[PDB]
Amino acid sequence: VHHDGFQTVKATIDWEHPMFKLYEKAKRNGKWNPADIDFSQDQKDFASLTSEEKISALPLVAGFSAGEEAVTLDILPMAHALARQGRLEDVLFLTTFMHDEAKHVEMFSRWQQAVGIGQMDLSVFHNDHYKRIFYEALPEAMNRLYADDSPEAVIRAATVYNMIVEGTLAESGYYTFRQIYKKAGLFPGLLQGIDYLNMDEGRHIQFGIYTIQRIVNEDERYYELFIRYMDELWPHVIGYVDYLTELGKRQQQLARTYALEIDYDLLRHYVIKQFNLRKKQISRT
Amino acid sequence: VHHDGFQTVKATIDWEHPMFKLYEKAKRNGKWNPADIDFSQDQKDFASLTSEEKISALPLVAGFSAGEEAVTLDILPMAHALARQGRLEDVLFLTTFMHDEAKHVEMFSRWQQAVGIGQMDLSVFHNDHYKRIFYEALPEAMNRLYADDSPEAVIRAATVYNMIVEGTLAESGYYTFRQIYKKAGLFPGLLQGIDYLNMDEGRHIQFGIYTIQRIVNEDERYYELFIRYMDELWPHVIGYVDYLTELGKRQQQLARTYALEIDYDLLRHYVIKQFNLRKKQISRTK
Ligand SMILES: CCCCCCCCCCCCCCCC(=O)O
Ligand SMILES: CCCCCCCCCCCCCCCC(=O)O
Ligand SMILES: [Fe+2]
Ligand SMILES: [Fe+2]
Numbered sequence: 382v383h384h385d386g387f388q389t390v391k392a393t394i395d396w397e398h399p400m401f402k403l404y405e406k407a408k409r410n411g412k413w414n415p416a417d418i419d420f421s422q423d424q425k426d427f428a429s430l431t432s433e434e435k436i437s438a439l440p441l442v443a444g445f446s447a448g449e450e451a452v453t454l455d456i457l458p459m460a461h462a463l464a465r466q467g468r469l470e471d472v473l474f475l476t477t478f479m480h481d482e483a484k485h486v487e488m489f490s491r492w493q494q495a496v497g498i499g500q501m502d503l504s505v506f507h508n509d510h511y512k513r514i515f516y517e518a519l520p521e522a523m524n525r526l527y528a529d530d531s532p533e534a535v536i537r538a539a540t541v542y543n544m545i546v547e548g549t550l551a552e553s554g555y556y557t558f559r560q561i562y563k564k565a566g567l568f569p570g571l572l573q574g575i576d577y578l579n580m581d582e583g584r585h586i587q588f589g590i591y592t593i594q595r596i597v598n599e600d601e602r603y604y605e606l607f608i609r610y611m612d613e614l615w616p617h618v619i620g621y622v623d624y625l626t627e628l629g630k631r632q633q634q635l636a637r638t639y640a641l642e643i644d645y646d647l648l649r650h651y652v653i654k655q656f657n658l659r660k661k662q663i664s665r666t
Numbered sequence: 667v668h669h670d671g672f673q674t675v676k677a678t679i680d681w682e683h684p685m686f687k688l689y690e691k692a693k694r695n696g697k698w699n700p701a702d703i704d705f706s707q708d709q710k711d712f713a714s715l716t717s718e719e720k721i722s723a724l725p726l727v728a729g730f731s732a733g734e735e736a737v738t739l740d741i742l743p744m745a746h747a748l749a750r751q752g753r754l755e756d757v758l759f760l761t762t763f764m765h766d767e768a769k770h771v772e773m774f775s776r777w778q779q780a781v782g783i784g785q786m787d788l789s790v791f792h793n794d795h796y797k798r799i800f801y802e803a804l805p806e807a808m809n810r811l812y813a814d815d816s817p818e819a820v821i822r823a824a825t826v827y828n829m830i831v832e833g834t835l836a837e838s839g840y841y842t843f844r845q846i847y848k849k850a851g852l853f854p855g856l857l858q859g860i861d862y863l864n865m866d867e868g869r870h871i872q873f874g875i876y877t878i879q880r881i882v883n884e885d886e887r888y889y890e891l892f893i894r895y896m897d898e899l900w901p902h903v904i905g906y907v908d909y910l911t912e913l914g915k916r917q918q919q920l921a922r923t924y925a926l927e928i929d930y931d932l933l934r935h936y937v938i939k940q941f942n943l944r945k946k947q948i949s950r951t952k
């Protein structure tokens with residue numbers, strides 16, 4: 382349907398808008414290119430591992446590659462909905478959000494290509510709980526926005542995408558990866574990629590917080606919706622984390638070999654800690 | 667609806683895909699930031715202009731600010747449609763396309779702000795023909811893709827967006843701006859912007875050509891749709907140009923004051939040339 386008029390013809394960009402400022406920061410701090418990352422030592426590290434040590438890295442990488450591809454695709458209806466609402470500064474920011482996610486997908490796939498597992502189907506490390514979140518709940522919540530852009534719908538989308546998938550699972554995923562492979566001196570190229578990714582994602586979570594808070598600010602009732610939507614997803618979050626833990630505990634060769642005492646109970650509590658932290662970043666008031 | 671699986675879990679990105687290669691080039695050649703452009707001399711240039719010289723420049727800027735804003739908003743359905751078809755490399759590319767357009771919107775708005783016309787409503791320089799293309803036909807063709815992603819729908823969208831709006835009107839707009847202010851030595855910040863923008867837009871048109879040609883390749887009968895869609899929009903293209911031309915003759919001062927022969931018959935023939943050139947870049951067979 383038709384454009385009424387255009388904001389940058391009638392007026393200008395709202396230069397003081399928080400998402401415009403976040404967009405400016407994204408351009409400044411968004412220059413990294415996954416094509417520049419040197420994965421040659423990652424290839425040597427991976428080839429050096431035993432077959433049993435080889436697999437133990439794959440479940441997390443499977444989770445990330447699928448995760449980045451999903452969020453690359455699944456942000457488009459948010460961008461559509463806020464565009465339809467005339468929120469131009471939000472849309473400007475979301476162009477950097479989307480391109481960031483494209484680089485994230487690119488980075489993990491380049492790592493798989495480089496270490497020699499591009500042809501391997503990593504879907505086998507997605508359990509029912511992972512599928513419930515990434516194959517189903519995430520795309521359902523986002524796609525809803527094409528036909529229903531109510532505050533309830535926008536809060537739920539931002540909750541699943543920004544606060545759970547990015548803010549709880551991905552944040553925990555980064556930590557985990559550094560806790561394991563940074564200590565083992567493994568996969569320097571991947572860890573460099575993860576570092577750049579973690580920086581991008583700090584901006585993404587700020588958009589999610591801004592979006593949820595601005596709606597809660599309209600009506601305190603939406604705060605309770607936010608809490609409820611977080612809690613509804615927790616079982617799948619922890620169900621996936623438990624699955625990953627149980628896998629790590631059955632394939633402990635890498636831990637032994639590299640002196641690592643992967644404290645899975647520490648990782649588990651970090652996930653819980655992230656979940657509760659996200660809740661605290663939204664105020665009822 | 668659900669994801670069946672994911673290409674970068676089952677396999678990898680198709681590293682040889684034409685749109686993946688275009689994506690890589692975009693990242694390499696797309697580092698410019700409108701926020702770094704010095705518009706202080708543009709401000710002084712604009713202030714030194716006579717009132718009649720001031721309104722010589724504004725209709726074109728009006729066309730571009732609205733144009734960039736429209737295409738920023740209106741690419742989203744194309745990205746959605748291609749994503750839903752599983753064309754991952756196309757989607758990776760389109761993230762650079764979209765962020766480019768965001769920078770283009772930004773650049774023209776920064777210029778308006780800097781020269782002191784941000785508070786002016788430039789809508790007054792969009793005539794019925796401009797409105798038909800940018801307020802109506804473009805969003806109608808793009809939004810159609812949410813419910814109809816047929817070959818016919820995708821060709822029509824790429825034709826309006828990439829071949830007419832970008833490849834005919836915008837290409838002719840860049841040229842025109844340089845043919846007028848580069849010679850005059852005016853608005854160096856804006857011209858610097860236009861140059862970076864023109865580089866970006868080369869990639870956008872390549873996506874349009876690839877998309878239209880990959881569909882035409884499946885069935886030559888789509889070639890005739892392409893031509894028909896181009897021709898349907900021509901009356902609004904030239905009708906906007908005549909309105910701009912009509913304005914530019916009714917305002918002689920910037921030309922004469924700045925030593926210029928703004929040859930409007932030359933620019934009109936640039937628009938005509940761009941249009942036939944776009945037609946030629948698609949073949950019945952390739
Ligand atoms: C063993 C401890 C469990 C740690 C939790 C691991 C979760 C796997 C990570 C997959 C989700 C990635 C989502 C990306 C979101 C974005 O890019 O904005
Ligand atoms: C008198 C000479 C007329 C020349 C034609 C002038 C047309 C004005 C340009 C406005 C269209 C801009 C469209 C944005 C394209 C994109 O950024 O992909
Ligand atoms: Fe990401
Ligand atoms: Fe993200």
Ligand SMILES: [Fe+2]
Pocket residue numbers: 510620
């Ligand atoms: Fe379970």
Ligand SMILES: [Fe+2]
Pocket residue numbers: 734737766767770863867
């Ligand atoms: Fe543009």
Ligand SMILES: [Fe+2]
Pocket residue numbers: 737767832867870
């Ligand atoms: Fe463009």
Ligand SMILES: [Fe+2]
Pocket residue numbers: 795905
């Ligand atoms: Fe007319």
